[PDB]
């Protein structure tokens, strides 16, 4: 696509910055790709893309492949990275990230 | 699209900045949308999008609707704006902008 919510270049840069195992930080990633500066609706659209199986929730397994949703050839997040990511977003402790938790997590 | 060469937000901002008749400046527009920082291939892809009729050249009439290629609801450039734009890019004086002239015009 010629134009989209996020610029391919920013996605590439955000991905490059966290290539090393255990170098991922969601705030840094969101900042670099430009998601933090988007509208609540755009943030929600990102939620649907990450929710690969359309269960209406982002499960730990989808966090593991979080980078791939942005860049198909990206690595999988390590268990430490996925667990920290889940802990950060899972306000209600149910083991997954719902739409409002996602919106709250991105802060936009 | 979730991701693209240019970010919708940057396109919106570049368009907003030149809403007034005769306020357009191609360098400012290219800078704001992020095209100046892209690869020669990405710059060429932009060329194809502007070349609406696929003649392999950007004619004055396509410069007039330049903004619309980026944002469908945008205004048409005034004759003064289109003429200045054409003069700037048309190195060989043939009345149109070819692919190399476009690449040279964007400077990327
Ligand atoms: Ca899911
Ligand atoms: Ca939850
Ligand atoms: Ca043409
Ligand atoms: Ca020419």
Residue with tokens 């291939």: B41
> From the CA of A2, how many Å to the nearest CA of chain B?
5
CB contact set of B81 (below 8 Å; sequence gap of 6+): B22, B24
CATH class of the domain defined by A1-108: mainly alpha
d(Cα A38, Cα A42) in Å, to the nearest integer? 6
Helix (H, G, I), strand (E, B) or coil at A93: coil
A59 is known to lie in a ligand binding site: yes
The CA distances from residue A107 to A44, A103, B36, B76, B85, in Å, are 11, 6, 30, 37, 41
d(Cα A87, Cα B26) in Å, to the nearest integer? 47
In this structure, what token pair is assigned to residue A85?
Answer: 């990511």
Q: How far, in Å, from the CA of A51 to the mean position of ligand 2?
A: 13
Helix (H, G, I), strand (E, B) or coil at B53: coil
> From the CA of A49, how many Å to the nearest CA of chain B?
8
Q: This structure's resolution (angstroms)?
A: 1.6
Contact A3 B70 (CB under 8 A): yes
Say if residues B30 and B36 touch (Cβ distance below 8 Å).
yes
DSSP code for B57? S
d(Cα B67, Cα A70) in Å, to the nearest integer? 28
Identify the CA nearest to A104 among candidates A15, A50, A31, A43. Answer: A43
The CA distances from residue A34 to A1, A7, A9, B1, in Å, are 17, 8, 11, 15
Round the CA-based radius of gyration of chain B to a whole number and report it: 13
State chain B's maximal CA–CA distance in angstroms.
Answer: 40
In this structure, what token pair is assigned to residue B60?
Answer: 């004055």
Strand partners, A3: B6
Alpha helices in B1-108 (DSSP H): 8-17, 26-33, 40-50, 60-64, 66-70, 79-89, 99-106
In this structure, what token pair is assigned to residue A34?
Answer: 């430009």
């Amino acid at each position: 696509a010629f134009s989209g919510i996020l610029a391919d270049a920013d996605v590439a840069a955000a991905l490059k910055a966290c290539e090393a195992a255990d170098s991922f930080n969601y705030k840094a990633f969101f900042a670099k790709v430009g998601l933090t500066a988007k509208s609540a609706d755009d943030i929600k659209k990102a939620f649907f893309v990450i929710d690969q199986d359309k269960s209406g929730f982002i499960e730990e397994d989808e966090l593991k492949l979080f980078l791939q949703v942005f860049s198909a050839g990206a690595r999988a997040l390590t268990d430490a990275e996925t667990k920290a990511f889940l802990k950060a977003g899972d306000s209600d402790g149910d083991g997954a990230i719902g739409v409002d938790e996602w919106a709250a997590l991105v802060k936009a």
